[PDB]
Amino acid sequence: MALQFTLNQDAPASAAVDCIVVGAFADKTLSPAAQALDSASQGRLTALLARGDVAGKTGSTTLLHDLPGVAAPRVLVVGLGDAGKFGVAPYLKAIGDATRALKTGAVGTALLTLTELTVKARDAAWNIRQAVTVSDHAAYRYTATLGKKKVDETGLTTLAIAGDDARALAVGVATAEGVEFARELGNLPPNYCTPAYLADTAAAFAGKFPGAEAEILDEAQMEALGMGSLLSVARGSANRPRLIVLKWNGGGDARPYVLVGKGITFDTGGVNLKTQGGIEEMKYDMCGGATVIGTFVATVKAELPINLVVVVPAVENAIDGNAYRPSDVITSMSGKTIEVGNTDAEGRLILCDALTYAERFNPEALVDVATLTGACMVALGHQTAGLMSKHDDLANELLAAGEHVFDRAWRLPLWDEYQGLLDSTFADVYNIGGRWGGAITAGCFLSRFTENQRWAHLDIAGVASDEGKRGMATGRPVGLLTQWLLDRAA
Amino acid sequence: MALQFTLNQDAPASAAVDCIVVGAFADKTLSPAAQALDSASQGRLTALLARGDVAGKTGSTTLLHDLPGVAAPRVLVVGLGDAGKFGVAPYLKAIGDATRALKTGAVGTALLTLTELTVKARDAAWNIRQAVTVSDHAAYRYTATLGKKKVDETGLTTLAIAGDDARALAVGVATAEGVEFARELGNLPPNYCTPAYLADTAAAFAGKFPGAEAEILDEAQMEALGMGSLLSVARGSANRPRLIVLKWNGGGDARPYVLVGKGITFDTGGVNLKTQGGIEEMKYDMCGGATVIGTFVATVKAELPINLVVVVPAVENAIDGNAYRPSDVITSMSGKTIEVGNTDAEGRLILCDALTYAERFNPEALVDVATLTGACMVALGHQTAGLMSKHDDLANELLAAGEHVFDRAWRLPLWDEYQGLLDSTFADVYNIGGRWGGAITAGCFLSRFTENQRWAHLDIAGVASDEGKRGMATGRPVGLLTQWLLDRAA
Amino acid sequence: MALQFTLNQDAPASAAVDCIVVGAFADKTLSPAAQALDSASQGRLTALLARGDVAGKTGSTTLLHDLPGVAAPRVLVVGLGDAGKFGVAPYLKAIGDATRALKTGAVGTALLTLTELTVKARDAAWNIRQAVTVSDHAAYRYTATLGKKKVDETGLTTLAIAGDDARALAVGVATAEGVEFARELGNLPPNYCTPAYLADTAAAFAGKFPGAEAEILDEAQMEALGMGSLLSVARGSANRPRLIVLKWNGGGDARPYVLVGKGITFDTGGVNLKTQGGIEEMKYDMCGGATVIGTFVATVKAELPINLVVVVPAVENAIDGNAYRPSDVITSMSGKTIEVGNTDAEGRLILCDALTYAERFNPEALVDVATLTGACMVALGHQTAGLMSKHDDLANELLAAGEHVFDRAWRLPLWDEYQGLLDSTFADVYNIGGRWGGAITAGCFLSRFTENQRWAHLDIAGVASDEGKRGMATGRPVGLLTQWLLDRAA
Amino acid sequence: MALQFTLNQDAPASAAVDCIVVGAFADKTLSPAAQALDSASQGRLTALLARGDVAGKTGSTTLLHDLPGVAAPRVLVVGLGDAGKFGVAPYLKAIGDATRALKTGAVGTALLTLTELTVKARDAAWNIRQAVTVSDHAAYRYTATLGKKKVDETGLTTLAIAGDDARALAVGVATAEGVEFARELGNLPPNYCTPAYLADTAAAFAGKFPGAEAEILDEAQMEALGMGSLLSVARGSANRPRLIVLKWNGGGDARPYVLVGKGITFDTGGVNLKTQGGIEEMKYDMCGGATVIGTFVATVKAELPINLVVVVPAVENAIDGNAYRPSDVITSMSGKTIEVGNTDAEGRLILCDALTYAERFNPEALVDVATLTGACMVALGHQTAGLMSKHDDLANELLAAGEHVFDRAWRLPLWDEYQGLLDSTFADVYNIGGRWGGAITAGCFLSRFTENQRWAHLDIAGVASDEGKRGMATGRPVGLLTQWLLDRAA
Numbered sequence A, B, C, D: 001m002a003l004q005f006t007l008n009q010d011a012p013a014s015a016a017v018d019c020i021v022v023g024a025f026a027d028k029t030l031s032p033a034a035q036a037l038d039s040a041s042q043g044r045l046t047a048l049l050a051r052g053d054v055a056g057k058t059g060s061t062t063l064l065h066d067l068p069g070v071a072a073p074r075v076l077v078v079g080l081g082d083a084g085k086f087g088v089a090p091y092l093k094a095i096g097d098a099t100r101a102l103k104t105g106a107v108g109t110a111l112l113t114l115t116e117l118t119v120k121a122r123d124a125a126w127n128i129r130q131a132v133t134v135s136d137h138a139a140y141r142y143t144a145t146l147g148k149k150k151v152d153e154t155g156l157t158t159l160a161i162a163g164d165d166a167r168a169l170a171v172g173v174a175t176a177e178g179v180e181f182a183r184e185l186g187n188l189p190p191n192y193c194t195p196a197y198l199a200d201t202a203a204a205f206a207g208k209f210p211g212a213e214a215e216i217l218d219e220a221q222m223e224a225l226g227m228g229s230l231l232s233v234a235r236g237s238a239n240r241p242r243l244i245v246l247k248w249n250g251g252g253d254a255r256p257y258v259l260v261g262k263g264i265t266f267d268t269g270g271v272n273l274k275t276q277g278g279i280e281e282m283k284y285d286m287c288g289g290a291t292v293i294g295t296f297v298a299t300v301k302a303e304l305p306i307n308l309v310v311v312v313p314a315v316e317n318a319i320d321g322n323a324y325r326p327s328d329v330i331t332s333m334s335g336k337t338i339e340v341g342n343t344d345a346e347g348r349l350i351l352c353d354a355l356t357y358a359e360r361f362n363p364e365a366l367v368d369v370a371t372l373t374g375a376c377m378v379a380l381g382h383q384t385a386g387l388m389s390k391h392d393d394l395a396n397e398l399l400a401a402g403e404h405v406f407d408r409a410w411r412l413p414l415w416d417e418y419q420g421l422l423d424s425t426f427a428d429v430y431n432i433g434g435r436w437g438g439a440i441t442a443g444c445f446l447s448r449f450t451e452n453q454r455w456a457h458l459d460i461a462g463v464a465s466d467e468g469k470r471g472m473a474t475g476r477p478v479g480l481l482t483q484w485l486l487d488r489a490a
């Protein structure tokens, strides 16, 4: 992991760490712990606020050396913005600002005092869990496939969190591990993160934890199950597919929560080749997979007293002399025939089969997570995931979770009047809907396969990764899904 | 108006009209009026139902000639689908079917008995209102700019509506007149429907009704008001702009409802010329204007007890040697400067000045209606309007209205984390937000100008007209808007 | 005219000119005049044929200096190909070869003996006519808008044509003057060849010849005639339009032949701007006009005994703040309204009013000539003009003409089952028919306006000019057209 | 100017300013002034260096508060990189870093000691000049067309520069004023920076300085001079063109240096409209003009002993119903006719007339500066200007200048075997050379007009501005140009 975390009950002026992180608002008001430091230093902070050397606005950090009265030789004061605007987002931002300021340089250990602040509509435990997740996220560094490049080794390695809720720290660490796991898999280049590598990785995790389990299916096994839709998409690739099935037995004999994630390890588009631009971003097209796996890792580490099953169709969509074609009609596991209007709308073609397969687990709730559509990105941007369901209660449960940890989704409708967009002359249903309403129509396609299920669909195409060669997997929506499971476990 | 309407309370078998319109369900059960006719004819309908000659599935009709016992020489039986699934949609589809079946041919007068059928969660008044709007909508024929083309003379002219609520009929007739007005304006070629013409049509209507009032501004007048954003869009075109302001004073003393409709009479895209297809559909880019004007017409003819102001900026966005250019920084009426990233995002540039304008009226609710974004089409389809607001109560008022009359909208978020996409180095604000979230950031742009207002935004790009050379303006969202105002008048 | 012509009946060996032009075939056999020269030189040609110095294959020439016995200091021997395969094409290619070989250099005067060669299915008159047109065509040099560029002064100025039909020479010379006129007009940059200039050039020619007459209309005059389709195209451009009407009264009392030529002097595409390449070739979009004017010139100079009217709508199709826009509905002269699906299908919109106009002349045959469609190029290539008509007899008259002079056309059907592609909801007719059949539906469009007429349409888009920055106007189809009129005068 | 400058010779520890700026290297060694401060503070810096709190790697800074012994309450230590690798680039990056670090916040006055550091192959004068230009460059904030947007008030206003060459400071300050002028002009939106405005700004500057002179020509005047190429570009736009001619007579009797800057104030591409992206960056297409004007400002304020003439054709290239069209043949001032292959290759068409114009001044060197070609960007990047000339000595003068001040250029060949690419059938010259060699053939085009001249061409398309909505005009190549003129004044 990027950082290690402890809890800490010291007086801020006595803490034996390389640096104390405190806060100041835009009107120059000091966070409580900042006040303790101001006292110990006999008004040195107030003197610097007065002089305008310590800024309180959003994004400001100021690093001060050897305040008198303070055991730690450093104090970082982070701006918290306008006090009357303080809440969830300023708090998360403030915490990320602190870590980004300490990421490189002389500070190995710091004390995060910001957890003491009231965040409206949130408790002390939440303040701790978010301290861990946000600061761990901000310290992430990818190195798996550097060869000769040396990276910087200095800076923050351990963060002491002001507080004493051990359980909250533990759930925050477990979450951060899930997040990191998902971002590593997302980030790995497609020639390393193949379907085989993803299944092995997930299995080697399962196998270290008493009560976690993995079952990996291969193409022969999937053929025997009738997963013909999934197999059409996979056929072109020299990298052969896997069905990754992960179980956590924390809920005794209760029915399980079932997550189904799209694990297209790379998407060329197939014969409908991606020629418009951004084909390089397509290692992120397994983030639904990475993300439900990350959630499994968090759930298992936090020992959540629930039953969780995670299903990930791990498939590569390659162009090839034996690749499926547009206008092909393929037989899904459910027996429905699908007409492939476009081979690059193949996520839903591996998901439909996994969702059918998941019926065997008798899900309490069934939620698929997928980088499905450019349409959703047009609809909601990188900011927010698309959510679709025919069950209001489930939809609201997932919305509430996203809102709670600020990893937001927004519902889109599955109105009947959208359904005829998927009409076909040659098969039961057409896999695409036309120029308009594509996020919704992909959802409608999925829903053909989930009629007897309490089901929801997260389109995560915008939230899962950033654009450009410097962009990374964000780890979203591991935040939302882990919180959803915490809610189910409470 | 394409049809005449009357209420009619005659017994079905005695009605003296050219055709009686009755219903049958997919399971062979007959509407009450169908029964009366069956019984008057001593089981002829039941006989034709058995043999299979009268279908009751959705979208089917049967024209029967000279049933013994029935004064009307014809009976039209409309299929109602599974009695199980009856409700809003099947009801409306049936009215439309009935009119389509009679539109051309021997029938002039017909009695519509279908209003008798119970629609779950809708009253008798709604059955009547909807019977008039859907019939009239289906009867529409465009003729304004045909020349030598002989058009079809036969068919439905008068529809008697079974029932006995004269206020319901009057309101339906008022709404349908509004819808028709909006559709005629949207349908007219842009060489006829210039900004000047759109201003005259509306003023002329306003001048015929006591309590209604019109004021038309020209460019000198808008110059004097400082509407520099609006005038920048307008500059390149030979068809000079107008500001159309309509007032209805049916609410005495009360703060008014204010509708602001986008009246781009044609959109070349300007210097950012539309080169990628669809340019020929930009005669519908004034449908924002067409439909708030329609709603005005409906409010006036229905004599609703409210104050209603309707502001329509009317501008043609033309490419020319004096066209505003991308990277220009234009001064809006509010004094905010706008960097023009793209001349084709010009709707919002005429609305933002109209919105500032509209503030003079101290509105109870401020609602803009615009064919704003391709993004909203990708998001919501032709099916559903995009709705945006910072006031939940106002948003819910509009959603419930559209939902009542099946002229639907869906909310999209206006969260802060989207605002940054509108940053500018050379002006207060950039007029476009980049590739993703296009409908939202357009909504965000508008919000810069309505911060003090109880305001909502309706992106009507998908909903306002149909694609291709035979698609016409829909009249949407006059239905939503008028039902919204009816709720305020209740 | 680039060359001077005379008939010449001198014996080859005595002709006092700078070069005698003779033929040899691929099998070494000599043209009759070649023989005379061989014999005058006591077997020098035969000696140079044996050694292989005189090739007789297609496209080869040999310049020989000072053959004993021959008054002319030079002999040019042109290759004629296999005597087996001799005919129209090899004959013409040989004349062209001879001129190309002499175009630059020491030769001023030459005797062309090649006219002696028998061309299967062609008379001696055709050999002579063709010797003048092909030579002159090959001699053309464009100079009008060069400035500082020094041009090459040496080379052929005068061609003596072996033979003794003075009417044949006079007709060839007349045709070549017409061809040259058409090529100069087509070649001129569109800033020089505006509609105004094209009108003046033609009027000026008409005014020099008794029995010839010109009338030029301006926009007020066309306004008054109701040519609202034509004027809609014209509106956007600063170079104001003209209607050029030329009359030749060589047929006394008879109904006239009427040619209608498309005179688009430049085509930006208008609001439907040409963005996809080739815009720089739209100076050739008046070649319809150039070539009917050429044919006029030929008819007059040849003094053909027929009445000939030539109508040229002259319009620049410009993009501007007052340009007609797509979806406009414009009123044509015939009273039919036209929906403008695309401003770049504007040729037919100027022709359709010119065609209605032309009805006043009560024509014997009404033929339009236009660079109408890319579709026709895809259909027929640069090689061959598209021909369309509802009158077989007229179609055959034009095919036979083009076939006689190797200026070829090919018929395309105008069947009814194509007419539906031009439907419109907002007007009597839509101006474009969609993706397929583009040349046909353009032909169909025009036919709406010529129903009472013995009419044909010639799409000359491929045939009228050559691609790329050194390709020029061909002069085609002046050859076809003039031969057609010669047949009517016979 | 964004900052005030003074020389300052105070001992570092006694300087009464808000912040002293010192350097440390990646290996922990301290700049001389850093040492003085360390020593005044009895080893505080050395202590903070050991603990790792003061980084010396490239791009790092550290703000230290109230070091005992130092009058200034703050010390900023700037990282200098490996002492091994120190030189031009690390020196400049360090000055920029220092200003960026102080731009916003509590510091108003600071002493820049960094000028003390030896830069291999550069004198003390260059250290000072560069300290002023890089600091001022980094301090720039654009504000001209902000409206309601509140901007950040705190931060650096005055920079004291350690050292004692007042001529060096004065020249730096002069250059920075020129750079700023050029950047303001480039940055201004094209609706403010019209050709008229650009002419007034320059004339107004010229009129404030004795020995400086401005003359502005309008279209009638350019008409009279026969600048028909320039005026063809200009025709379509409502913003009428200007010829700006600035003279500085600091060299008495001598032949002048003449700079010709391309002043396209916006470029739509014209009829060859920019449809393929980037159109919004064409406000930078007058940077050729902006930067020769900047250089003028620098030459005048620095009072260089040379004659300097600066000619700027100022033209907006607009699409309109009177826009020149592709295939037009236009008559240049030199009398050469030009075939317009593409209206978007219009820069060279305004320069070629300005160049002919410029011949009146009998120049010692004639240098054009233009944002000419995308080709040059493909060739050289944003990093480096394309340089072209037929005179090696002049080329070397400019390369050495750019190399001295790190405002770099690179030569591209103007060989004859490239000239043929500009052939034309309809004019003396074609204005574009096809797909390859685009920067070279543009250079070749210009050369047709400067054959009698000691002339060079600088393609500044990559170098003049930064990409995207927050990229600004760089000011480049004012640095190169001014250093070039300094070398001529030496």
Ligand SMILES: [Ca+2]
Pocket: B320, B321, B322, C320, C321, C322, D320, D321, D322
């Ligand atoms: Ca104009």
Ligand SMILES: [Zn+2]
Pocket: A267, A269, A343, A344, A345, A346, A347
């Ligand atoms: Zn795909």
Ligand SMILES: [Zn+2]
Pocket: A264, A267, A285, A344, A346, A347, A371
């Ligand atoms: Zn995919």
Ligand SMILES: [Zn+2]
Pocket: B267, B269, B343, B344, B345, B346, B347
């Ligand atoms: Zn637009």
Ligand SMILES: [Zn+2]
Pocket: B264, B267, B285, B344, B346, B347, B371
């Ligand atoms: Zn618009």
Ligand SMILES: [Zn+2]
Pocket: C267, C269, C343, C344, C345, C346, C347
């Ligand atoms: Zn065209």
Ligand SMILES: [Zn+2]
Pocket: C264, C267, C285, C344, C346, C347, C371
């Ligand atoms: Zn044309």
Ligand SMILES: [Zn+2]
Pocket: D267, D269, D343, D344, D345, D346, D347
């Ligand atoms: Zn250009």
Ligand SMILES: [Zn+2]
Pocket: D264, D267, D285, D344, D346, D347, D371
């Ligand atoms: Zn340019």
